[PDB]
Amino acid sequence: GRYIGPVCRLCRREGVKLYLKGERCYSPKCAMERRPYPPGQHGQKRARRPSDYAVRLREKQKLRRIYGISERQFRNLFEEASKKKGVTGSVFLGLLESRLDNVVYRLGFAVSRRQARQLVRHGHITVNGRRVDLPSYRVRPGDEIAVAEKSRNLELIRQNLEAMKGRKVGPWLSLDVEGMKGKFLRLPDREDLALPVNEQLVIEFYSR
Amino acid sequence: IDTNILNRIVDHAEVTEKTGVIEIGPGIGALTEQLAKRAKKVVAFEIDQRLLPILKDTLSPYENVTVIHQDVLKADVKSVIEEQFQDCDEIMVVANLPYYVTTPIIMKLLEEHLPLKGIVVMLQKEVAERMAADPSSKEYGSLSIAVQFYTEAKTVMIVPKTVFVPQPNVDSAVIRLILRDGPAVDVENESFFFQLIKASFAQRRKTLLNNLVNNLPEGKAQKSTIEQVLEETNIDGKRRGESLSIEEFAALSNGLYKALF
Amino acid sequence: DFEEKMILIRRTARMQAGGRRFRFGALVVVGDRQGRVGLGFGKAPEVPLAVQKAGYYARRNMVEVPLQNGTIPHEIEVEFGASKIVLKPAAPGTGVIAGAVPRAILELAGVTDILTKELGSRNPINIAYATMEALRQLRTKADVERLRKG
Amino acid sequence: PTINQLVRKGREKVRKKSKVPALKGAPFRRGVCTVVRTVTPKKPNSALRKVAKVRLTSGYEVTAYIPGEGHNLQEHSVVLIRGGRVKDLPGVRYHIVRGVYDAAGVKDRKKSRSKYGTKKPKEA
RNA sequence: GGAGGAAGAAGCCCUUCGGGGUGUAAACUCCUGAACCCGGGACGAAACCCCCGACGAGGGGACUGACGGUACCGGGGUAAUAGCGCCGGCCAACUCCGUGCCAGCAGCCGCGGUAAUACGGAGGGCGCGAGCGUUACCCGGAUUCACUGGGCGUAAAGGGCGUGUAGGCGGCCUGGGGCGUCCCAUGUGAAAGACCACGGCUCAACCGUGGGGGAGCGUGGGAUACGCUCAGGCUAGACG
RNA sequence: AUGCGCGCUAGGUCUCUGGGUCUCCUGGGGGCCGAAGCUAACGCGUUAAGCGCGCCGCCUGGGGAGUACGGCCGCAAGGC
Ligand SMILES: [Zn+2]
Structure with missing residues (x-):
């Protein structure tokens, strides 16, 4: 299961523009350009100084809600990252950025991660010429992520990937727009990502 | 403070x-x-x-x-x-x-x-x-x-x-x-001018022609009219719309309303 | 010009001839997240005056911290009164694992990765003083070599 | 002490003490109510607190607290006894699980329903 | 379910009567295609046996599937369950009515007598989510049995004082032994489990194949600084 | 209200009792101020509650309670 329901309310609560909706959250409608205060009856009141715990929780929540994965899955990924070599922050973000749904969103086949999840699940995506329908699949440096032949005639995919013309993909990825495919060069770095997140807070949270 | x-x-x-x-x-x-x-x-x-x-x-x-x-x-x-x-x-x-x-x-x-x-x-x-x-x-x-x-x-x-x-x-x-x-710029049909502006920016990813034709109740009716008007006015609908200006919009508006208003 | 934090505001009272007279104490850390930390304690009849005095004291009492890779050169154990602080270096990607008072102090120091722990008494004022002293008692390789060899 | 003393005599381990003797290392117990009475708080509080004298399947007979707005406990009703101690009442160290055996879920609950066990109110 | 979707529908709540919130949330357009139907359909099973080789090594031919018409594949094709706890400080989450030390709440500190963010209900918010809470037990926090790592003038804690047995501990300079101690090699430290890496189930859980690591203890060899022991000596402790 | 033995770490002052070259140096004992240091503070500070070492005896929230019980010792009270 996941979180299904209102979304821009999370944009408001976090106080940042989390691009969770696709095209609306670019146009003057993201509900962060209007009412940038948290939701509810006591949204636009004076904010008290937040606790250390509050700050850490908010940072972790923001990071989790960007990728829209379970708290259990988030904890699992953190525990895996903390057990590996190198800086925990870098490794954790690398592991988060390797998810198949996220990779599809980065490639440009889908506009929102909530849409990439549906594309992957309903089966319109192959890795190394084999159908995979799980958003949580982890890709390694050097897999071909493509759209299935049976799914290339869809309006949705054509509109999505046609707009990628005159648009650049991330450095840690390569794309073939006319061939409708993509390549995972390597794991991304801290600076390759435009996250409004300081991972140090997330590290300090899961020590409590 | x-x-x-x-x-x-x-x-x-x-x-x-x-x-x-x-x-x-x-x-x-x-x-x-x-x-x-x-x-x-x-x-x-x-x-x-x-x-x-x-x-x-x-x-x-x-x-x-x-x-x-x-x-x-x-x-x-x-x-x-x-x-x-x-x-x-x-x-x-x-x-x-x-x-x-x-x-x-x-x-x-x-x-x-x-x-x-x-x-x-x-x-x-x-x-x-x-x-x-x-x-x-x-x-x-x-x-x-x-x-x-x-x-x-x-x-x-x-x-x-x-x-x-x-x-x-x-x-x-x-x-x-x-x-x-x-x-x-001088527009006789100011209201529909504004609606045209909002139509060209209903979706910022699609091309201008598709925007204009897909945002008018009469859009289906006057597909050919829209195409010819955008072609004649030297500012084609093949662009996105974000690359236009007040002047191109004025000329296009004149093109539409002098002939269909 | 610097960043400030509020460890605690507390209200103390003394009895008088038919009534109580109140006073306010504020514990304030002033730092630049670069390796300069000051800690002040201010007493005043009013809260704003207490904060002002604590800020002034903290500015006038500053210590330079020898940070390498955003951490501490070596482990330290310092006892102030009944309270005791333990600081320990950590590899990059650990984060300041510490209680409220140390954390506050160390964040303004530019420290990024430390393992700490408080022992014995846990009076926040005494903990702050102990931590401050422990920071004051840090030497690097260069200083040690200079003292020993010359 | 000296290392010699530690070798000779050592350190005595601290053993825990149970707060719920009547349970006999079980999550719950099944008992029968014999007396249903209202009692008085310890000091700063004043109220009438519902208390049942329950005899358990253990070799024990102890007092248990009845939480909620209203109950239906007679002098025979089979009940379930749970851990937990009332701060005020001097001698009760057990609670009653609502809506289990003969005890019924308190009426018109809408907020905290898992406790005070009541079914979800159907709404059209 | 996904994308778009009002300077913002209706109802409900609050209101300084202007409005604010629930909220792009809904309704609404388009798109996908859990469930469901049709067809196909397994890996796990090649041996024993039989013919030619000797009754051997090779070679050749058949039989055998509970799971199970299941997994799975191909083709059609439907918008298609959300609950649970908490919102006084610990500790993330605030207002309006009801009640007036009553009904109650409570893990601690405590809250309940007329203006309750602490009880009951609504609106709203927060955390987790096919789950969420409660009770019981264990380790942590507890440096609160303190080897790592605590104390005993007044906070609990120096025996009423001597003499002394077992025990514990022990000054300097040499030499022998090599008991403790340290090092090298080797045997053992089973298989699972733990760590690392690489692989198989569409990922994971799960499983496979490798590689280490390991406290302890045997066997052989080596070192003698420090403890131990044997022999000689010295005068700074002690004794005369 | 401070177990014993040993070593180390400014001094000043008042006493009791020995030896010396007797202006004053040199042992031992009893007090008072105080360096460093210690202590929660009061305070201690070469007669340490400082810095260390060796051995012994105790402590682990307040009541219940030095109580009940069992044992040992006493003529008994009673004690451990
Ligand atoms: Zn948004």
């Missing part, structure tokens, strides 16, 4: 001992004190019953202040100006607008064709480039067109987030609009 930012805003608004000013949402009257000190007779449109005593107490030692218990949108400001500023030369507008009713306020003020000299407002940076931009700016849109048609506008001051007493969520930009004597 607001100690000197207000003074800078008033300086940029360029008020003097003979200019009249309009205040919206005064609250306590942080800007109002400076305006009274520097400018001539002022006016306020407070609607909050709770903050009225505080505003009254703030403006007790001032004699050039008038307070109105009307909402800006509902009140016809033409009579307000003809009644209050009966001797003044230039009437400007200075206010800090409360997020939600910020675009409606500006639109209502501009659409009523006031004899205002101009406007200087403090709003969020978010919708600040959205109302002062250029072709291919990633912020070009309907709001930009409306503001840069009705008046001449450019962003002046960038107040960062870390200035206020309770830390807000968004950076702010004080914008100054010098009102324009005559509309930049």
Whole structure:
């Protein structure tokens, strides 16, 4: 299961523009350009100084809600990252950025991660010429992520990937727009990502 | 914290001992004190019953202040100006607008064709480039067109987030609009002109032709007409729309309405 | 010009001839997140005056911290009164694992990765003083070599 | 002590003490109510607190607290006894699980329903 | 379910009567295609046996599937379950009515007598989510049995004082032994489990194949600084 | 209200008792101020509650309670 329901309310609560909706959250409608205060009856009141715990929780929540994965899955990924070599922050973000749904969103086949999840699940995506329908699949440096032949005639995919013309993909990825495919060069770095997140807070949270 | 930012805003608004000013949402009257000190007779449109005593107490030692218990949108400001500023030369507008009713306020003020000299407002940076931009700016849109048609506008001051007493969520930009004597381009069918502008920017990813044809009730009917008109006007629909300007829009509007209006 | 934090405001009272007279104490850390930390304690009849005095004291009492890779050169154990602080270096990617008072102090120091622990008494004032002293008692390789060899 | 003393005598381990003897290392117990009475708080509080004298399947007979707005406990009703101690009442160290055996879920609950066990109110 | 979707529908709640929230949330357009139907359909099973080789090594031919018409594949094709706890400080989450030390709440500090963010209910918010809470037990926090790592003047804690047995501990300079101690090699430290890496189930859980690591203890060799022991000597402790 | 033995770490002052070259140096004992240092503080500070070492005896929230019980010792009270 996941979180299904209102979304821009999370944009408001976090106080940042989390691009969770696709095209609306670019146009003057993201509900962060209007009412940038948290939701509810006591949204636009004076904010008290937040606790250390509050700050850490908010940072972790923001990071989790960007990728829209379970708290259990988030904890699992953190525990895996903390057990590996190198800086925990870098490794954790690398592991988060390797998810198949996220990779599809980065490639440009889908506009929102909530849409990439549906594309992957309903089966319109192959890795190394084999159908995979799980958003949580982890890709390694050097897999071909493509759209299935049976799914290339869809309006949705054509509109999505046609707009990628005159648009650049991330450095840690390569794309073939006319061939409708993509390549995972390597794991991304801290600076390759435009996250409004300081991972140090997330590290300090899961020590409590 | 607001100690000197207000003074800078008033300086940029360029008020003097003979200019009249309009205040919206005064609250306590942080800007109002400076305006009274520097400018001539002022006016306020407070609607909050709770903050009225505080505003009254703030403006007790001032004699050039008038307070109105009307909402800006509902009140016809033409009579307000003809009644209050009966001797003044230039009437400007200075206010800090409360997020939600910020675009409606500006639109209502501009659409009523006031004899205002101009406007200087403090709003969020978010919708600040959205109302002062250029072709291919990633912020070009309907709001930009409306503001840069009705008046001449450019962003002046960038107040960062870390200035206020309770830390807000968004950076702010004080914008100054010098009102324009005559509309930049002449359109007979102004309403459908505006709808055309909003149609070309219904979705910013699609091409202009597809935008125009897919956003009109008669769009299906006049596909050929739309195509021919965009072709003849030397500005084709094969572009996105964000790369156009006021001039191309004017020519295209003329093309549509001279032939189908 | 610097960043400030509020460890605690507390209200103390002394009895008088028919009544109580109150006073306020504030514990304030002033730092630049670069390796300069000051800690002040201010007493005043009013809260704002207490904060002002604490800020002034913290500015006038500053210590330079020898940070390498955003951490501490070596482990340290310092006892102030009944309270005791333990600081320990950590590899990059650990984060300041510490209680409220140390954390506050160390964040303004530019420390990014430390393992700490408080022992014995846990009076926040005494903990702050102990931590401050422990920071004051840090030497690097260069200083040690200079003292020993010359 | 000295290392020699530690070798000779050592350190005595601290043993825990049970707060719920009547349970006999079980999450719950099944008992029968014999007396249903209202009693008085310990010091600063004043109220009438419902208390049942329950005889358990253990070799024990103890007092248990009845939480909620209203109950239906007679002098025979089979009940479930749970851990937990009332701060005020001097001698009760057990609670009653609502809506289990003969005890019924308190009426018109809408907020905290898992406790005070009541079914979800159907709404059309 | 996904994308778009009002300066913002209706109802409900609050209101300084202007409005604010629930909220792009809904309704609404388009798109996908859990469930469901049709067809196909397994890996797990090649041996024993039989013919030619000797009754051997090779070679050649058949039989055998509970799971199970299941997994899975191909083709059609439907917008298609959300609950649970908490919102006084610990500790993330605030207002309006009801009640007036009553009904109650409670892990601690405590809250309940007329203006209750602490009880009851609504609106709203927060955390987790096919789950969420409660009770019981264990380790942590507990440096609160303190080897790592505590104390005993007044906070609990120096025996009423001597003499002394077992025990514990022990000054300097040499030489022998090599018991403790340290090092090298080797045997053992089973298979699972733990760590690393690489692989198989569409990922994971799960499983496979490798590689280490390991406290302890045997066997052989080596070192003698420090403890131990044997022999000689010295005068700074002690004794005369 | 401070177990014993040993070594180390400014001094000044008042006493009791020995030897010396007797202006004053040199042992031992009893007090008072105080360096460094210690202590929660009061305070201790070469007669340490400092810096260390060796051995012994005790402590682990307040009541219940030095109580009940069992044992040992006493003529008994009673004690451990
Ligand atoms: Zn948004």
